[PDB]
Amino acid sequence: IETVPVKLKPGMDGPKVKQWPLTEEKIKALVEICTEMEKEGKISKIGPENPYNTPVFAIKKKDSTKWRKLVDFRELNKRTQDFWEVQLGIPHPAGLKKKKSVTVLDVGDAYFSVPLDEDFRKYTAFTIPSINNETPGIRYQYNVLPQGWKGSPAIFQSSMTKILEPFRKQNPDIVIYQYMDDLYVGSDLEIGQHRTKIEELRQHLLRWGLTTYELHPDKWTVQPIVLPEKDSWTVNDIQKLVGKLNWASQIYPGIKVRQLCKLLRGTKALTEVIPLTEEAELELAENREILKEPVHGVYYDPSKDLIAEIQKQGQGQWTYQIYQEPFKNLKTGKYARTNDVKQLTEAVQKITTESIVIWGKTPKFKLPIQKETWETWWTEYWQATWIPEWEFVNTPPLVKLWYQL
Amino acid sequence: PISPIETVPVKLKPGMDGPKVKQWPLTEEKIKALVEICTEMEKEGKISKIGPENPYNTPVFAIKKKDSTKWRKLVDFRELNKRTQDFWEVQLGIPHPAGLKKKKSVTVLDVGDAYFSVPLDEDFRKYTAFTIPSINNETPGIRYQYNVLPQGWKGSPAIFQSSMTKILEPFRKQNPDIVIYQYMDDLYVGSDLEIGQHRTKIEELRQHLLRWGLTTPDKKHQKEPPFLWMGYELHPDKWTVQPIVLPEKDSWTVNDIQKLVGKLNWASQIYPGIKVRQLCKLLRGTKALTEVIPLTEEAELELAENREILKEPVHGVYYDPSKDLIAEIQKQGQGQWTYQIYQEPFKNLKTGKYARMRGAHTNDVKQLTEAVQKITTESIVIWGKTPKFKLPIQKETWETWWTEYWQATWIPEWEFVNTPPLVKLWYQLEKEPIVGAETFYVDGAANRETKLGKAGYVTNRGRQKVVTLTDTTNQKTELQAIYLALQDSGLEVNIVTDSQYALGIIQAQPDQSESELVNQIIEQLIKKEKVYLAWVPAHKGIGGNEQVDKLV
Numbered sequence: 009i010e011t012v013p014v015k016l017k018p019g020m021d022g023p024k025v026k027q028w029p030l031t032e033e034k035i036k037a038l039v040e041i042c043t044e045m046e047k048e049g050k051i052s053k054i055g056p057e058n059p060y061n062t063p064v065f066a067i068k069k070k071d072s073t074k075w076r077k078l079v080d081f082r083e084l085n086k087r088t089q090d091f092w093e094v095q096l097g098i099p100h101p102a103g104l105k106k107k108k109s110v111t112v113l114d115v116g117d118a119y120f121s122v123p124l125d126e127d128f129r130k131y132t133a134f135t136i137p138s139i140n141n142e143t144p145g146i147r148y149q150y151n152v153l154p155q156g157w158k159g160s161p162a163i164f165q166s167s168m169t170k171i172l173e174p175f176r177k178q179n180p181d182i183v184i185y186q187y188m189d190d191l192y193v194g195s196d197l198e199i200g201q202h203r204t205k206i207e208e209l210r211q212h213l214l215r216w217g218l219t220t221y222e223l224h225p226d227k228w229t230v231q232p233i234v235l236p237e238k239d240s241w242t243v244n245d246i247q248k249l250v251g252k253l254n255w256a257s258q259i260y261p262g263i264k265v266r267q268l269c270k271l272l273r274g275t276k277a278l279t280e281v282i283p284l285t286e287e288a289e290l291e292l293a294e295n296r297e298i299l300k301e302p303v304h305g306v307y308y309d310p311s312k313d314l315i316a317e318i319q320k321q322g323q324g325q326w327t328y329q330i331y332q333e334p335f336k337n338l339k340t341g342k343y344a345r346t347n348d349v350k351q352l353t354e355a356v357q358k359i360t361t362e363s364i365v366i367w368g369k370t371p372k373f374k375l376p377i378q379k380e381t382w383e384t385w386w387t388e389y390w391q392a393t394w395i396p397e398w399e400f401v402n403t404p405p406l407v408k409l410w411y412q413l
Numbered sequence: 414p415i416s417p418i419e420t421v422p423v424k425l426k427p428g429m430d431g432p433k434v435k436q437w438p439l440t441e442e443k444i445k446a447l448v449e450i451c452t453e454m455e456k457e458g459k460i461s462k463i464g465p466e467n468p469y470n471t472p473v474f475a476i477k478k479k480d481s482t483k484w485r486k487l488v489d490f491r492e493l494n495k496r497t498q499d500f501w502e503v504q505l506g507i508p509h510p511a512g513l514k515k516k517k518s519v520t521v522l523d524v525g526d527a528y529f530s531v532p533l534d535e536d537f538r539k540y541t542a543f544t545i546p547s548i549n550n551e552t553p554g555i556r557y558q559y560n561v562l563p564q565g566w567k568g569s570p571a572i573f574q575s576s577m578t579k580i581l582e583p584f585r586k587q588n589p590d591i592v593i594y595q596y597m598d599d600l601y602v603g604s605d606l607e608i609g610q611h612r613t614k615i616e617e618l619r620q621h622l623l624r625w626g627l628t629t630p631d632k633k634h635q636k637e638p639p640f641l642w643m644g645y646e647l648h649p650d651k652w653t654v655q656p657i658v659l660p661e662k663d664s665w666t667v668n669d670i671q672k673l674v675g676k677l678n679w680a681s682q683i684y685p686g687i688k689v690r691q692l693c694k695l696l697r698g699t700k701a702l703t704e705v706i707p708l709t710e711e712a713e714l715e716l717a718e719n720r721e722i723l724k725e726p727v728h729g730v731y732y733d734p735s736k737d738l739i740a741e742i743q744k745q746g747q748g749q750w751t752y753q754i755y756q757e758p759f760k761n762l763k764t765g766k767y768a769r770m771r772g773a774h775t776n777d778v779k780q781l782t783e784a785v786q787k788i789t790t791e792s793i794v795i796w797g798k799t800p801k802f803k804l805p806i807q808k809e810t811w812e813t814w815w816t817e818y819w820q821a822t823w824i825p826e827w828e829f830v831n832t833p834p835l836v837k838l839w840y841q842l843e844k845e846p847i848v849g850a851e852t853f854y855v856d857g858a859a860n861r862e863t864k865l866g867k868a869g870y871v872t873n874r875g876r877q878k879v880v881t882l883t884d885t886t887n888q889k890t891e892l893q894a895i896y897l898a899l900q901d902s903g904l905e906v907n908i909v910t911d912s913q914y915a916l917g918i919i920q921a922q923p924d925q926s927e928s929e930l931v932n933q934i935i936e937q938l939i940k941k942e943k944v945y946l947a948w949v950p951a952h953k954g955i956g957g958n959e960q961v962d963k964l965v
């Protein structure tokens with residue numbers, strides 16, 4: 009094939025990211041995998057004249073017992089964003105979120121059959137560490153398009169198009185979207201018809217590169233901020249209600265509270281019961297009406313980053329909001345059903361997947377957890393071929409409450 | 414003496430050209446020593462004479478060696494170094510003794526003339542050019558360049574270590590059972606063979622080394638146990654830290670206390686129970702190095718107890734990968750934690766301590782979990798697996814706290830061990846408003862410019878009270894208001910605040926804090942029999958909130 013030259017944003021040097029500690033079984037796995045990739049010429053060993061590094065991990069392929077190499081190219085991708093977004097970007101179809109069934113397929117094996125621009129390879133350096141630092145790391149770079157680098161799909165773009173043309177021509181009412189290592193394939197077929205068409209697509213893919221799960225996006229609906237309807241009300245109940253509407257009012261135009269406050273008049277005990285008024289009973293219904301709806305006035309700005317906040321609700325339930333501008337929610341939701349980190353990890357991948365389908369973009373996550381706990385454990389349950397950006401926050405206990413139920 | 418191994422290609426940083434520093438004029442004897450030294454280096458291949466066509470130069474000097482009458486050349490590579498490409502890091506961590514597989518034999522081999530024994534990229538040599546000035550700078554000086562890795566150049570540690578790795582490689586392949594640790598210009602080589610076969614395998618490794626340009630000591634000259642390395646004393650089947658002496662002093666200076674703490678911290682990886690909190694407190698508001706700091710009675714108590722711990726020599730064991738890894742943690746008080754890691758009780762691979770304060774306010778359950786994360790990471794680094802923990806907290810205490818707390822967590826497999834003090838929760842807030850309990854609506858305020866502030870409460874029983882506060886902050890007063898309400902309330906209380914900031918602090922159920930206020934509140938919360946804490950939005954005309962709002 010023909011090597012397409014690549015360039016970093018002017019000034020920016022390559023990634024010099026430290027390698028996180030790996031358990032023995034993950035190191036062993038990485039050595040097998042890399043010895044085999046080297047034999048096949050996909051990667052080559054490198055000397056100390058290469059100052060760059062990006063982290064590398066081992067994960068178990070989604071539904072499958074078998075170790076897989078996961079390279080963390082978040083830094084490189086950030087430093088390459090001129091290349092994979094502006095020069096050769098993949099357009100994201102608005103029709104994908106519309107389909108009844110979307111299937112995700114790994115097409116990462118595609119990239120290893122294509123050479124990487126030689127003047128770029130040094131930036132793809134990574135290090136397999138050793139236990140207790142008893143031997144120097146084993147160091148490689150890529151000779152072909154690496155998985156996980158946003159440049160790879162940008163470059164392989166015209167090859168993918170040639171591969172998909174027949175299947176696309178024969179099935180016009182099917183949307184296929186490439187994002188990183190995955191192919192998203194949506195249709196409105198009945199589920200058996202949909203699955204059949206995926207297999208045919210696997211065969212097309214098979215004549216080039218692939219081995220020998222289904223979203224239902226148009227069935228995604230927001231998790232409305234929920235206002236209870238109760239038997240009787242206490243003072244405490246009303247205040248908790250006011251605080252909650254008070255918070256919605258900062259997002260949804262038209263939210264009203266005034267009638268409820270009138271109920272609080274005076275300085276009375278917390279458990280006391282208080283009579284329910286028509287003005288309140290109505291205003292309450294009027295608000296509850298607005299929470300069911302899209303936020304009037306909020307719209308996706310393609311130029312701006314996506315952000316996802318996640319609150320631990322307890323009993324295995326998690327809530328989350330996606331926004332570009334704080335409090336202006338493009339999507340809210342919940343994830344449900346062991347282990348606090350295993351669940352958070354599952355919620356992050358699920359939220360990321362939906363983000364890819366809806367916007368073609370991945371969110372920066374605000375994660376309610378100690379950095380070090382997350383760093384240690386996340387790979388133990390991670391199954392995606394990508395890695396979202398994240399930071400760590402202490403959840404405002406009030407935010408948690410307003411998104412209950 | 415100059416390895417036949419292929420060179421690492423090297424570059425200057427992309428925008429830059431090689432150094433051009435002017436050679437200062439030297440003395441006659443300095444000039445003489447250098448010509449002597451350089452002639453001997455030139456014969457061995459280390460350096461070469463070059464023409465005047467080479468534009469590059471970096472300064473050389475000579476200083477009399479070790480007070481003796483030997484001279485050492487000394488090249489100043491600061492300028493070339495600033496222009497040389499960045500390299501990859503030699504090591505990203507250093508091995509810990511506790512992580513070493515036990516071996517029947519280990520011998521030490523040092524490489525002689527390590528840097529000078531390794532070639533330098535042909536294309537880069539012209540950048541290492543230096544000039545021995547002629548006397549009084551009358552005539553053109555003598556110009557050489559390096560053919561090998563210079564001492565003091567930026568790339569030499571890294572190109573050396575990688576050259577050796579390339580050389581060791583095939584011998585590793587044919588001897589997969591043999592352990593070789595590369596450290597600077599030492600090799601540590603270890604086997605489970607019997608002396609003779611080991612003696613054999615060594616001289617065979619020496620031989621592979623010599624085919625490659627590397628001279629090593631012979632049997633007569635190879636050093637003996639214990640091996641002293643990285644501040645450790647490594648005997649054949651136990652290890653410890655190198656000898657530690659705690660000075661006797663009538664009085665301590667800043668600098669004395671820093672070195673004390675450095676030694677204690679270092680001793681703490683095998684002497685269990687070391688403490689430095691009270692000594693570190695003295696270091697606060699750091700003054701002059703020479704300054705005398707009188708010891709508090711608590712620092713004196715601490716030094717004394719450390720003194721006893723270090724009284725009798727302790728040692729550590731090496732790692733048997735077939736056995737399991739157990740880790741035990743004990744509370745030592747005031748955010749201080751100590752741990753031991755063994756495989757067979759109670760023979761420690763290593764020990765440690767954890768003191769860190771993550772946050773301004775915490776409780777023991779949070780600190781214990783943080784200490785577990787720390788020890789887990791350390792275990793992954795050192796042994797490549799997580800230990801089985803034995804923790805001083807009930808499965809129910811921990812279950813209760815972490816299911817209810819808003820942050821996620823997950824410690825590896827642990828089990829409870831009864832090693833007081835146990836970690837417990839000292840109070841729990843209530844889930845529901847309390848019937849029959851007085852409801853306090855509290856509030857606080859601080860004038861941003863005057864910094865003066867009022868704090869107080871209003872009650873459903875008509876009670877009321879407000880106080881004045883000098884030089885405080887809006888945050889400080891809102892905690893004052895909550896504290897007031899606790900002091901003046903009975904054993905059961907509802908409290909209503911509009912401070913998310915106070916709520917957050919209290920909701921998380923701290924049992925220790927840097928704020929004295931927050932410790933006072935904590936004393937109160939523990940003495941109470943029931944507290945329910947609620948939040949209302951400010952300035953919304955909510956009930957009692959507005960009353961106390963204007964009051965303050």
Ligand SMILES: CCOP(=O)(COc1ccc(CCc2cnc3c(c2)C(=O)N(C)c2cccnc2N3CC)cc1)OCC
Nearest residue numbers: 508513516517518519592594601602603640642647648649
């Ligand atoms: C002539 C026969 O040998 P010998 O002179 C003494 O032999 C010893 C000395 C120490 C140990 C401790 C474990 C032990 C195991 N591995 C070690 C070491 C010690 C060690 O000393 N260091 C410095 C080290 C540092 C970092 C990474 N790896 C190591 N290695 C690599 C082999 C074991 C054997 O007589 C013994 C028959």
Ligand SMILES: [Cl-]
Nearest residue numbers: 222223224225
């Ligand atoms: Cl779904």
Ligand SMILES: [Cl-]
Nearest residue numbers: 668669672702
């Ligand atoms: Cl000193």
Ligand SMILES: [Mg+2]
Nearest residue numbers: 596597598599
């Ligand atoms: Mg040394």
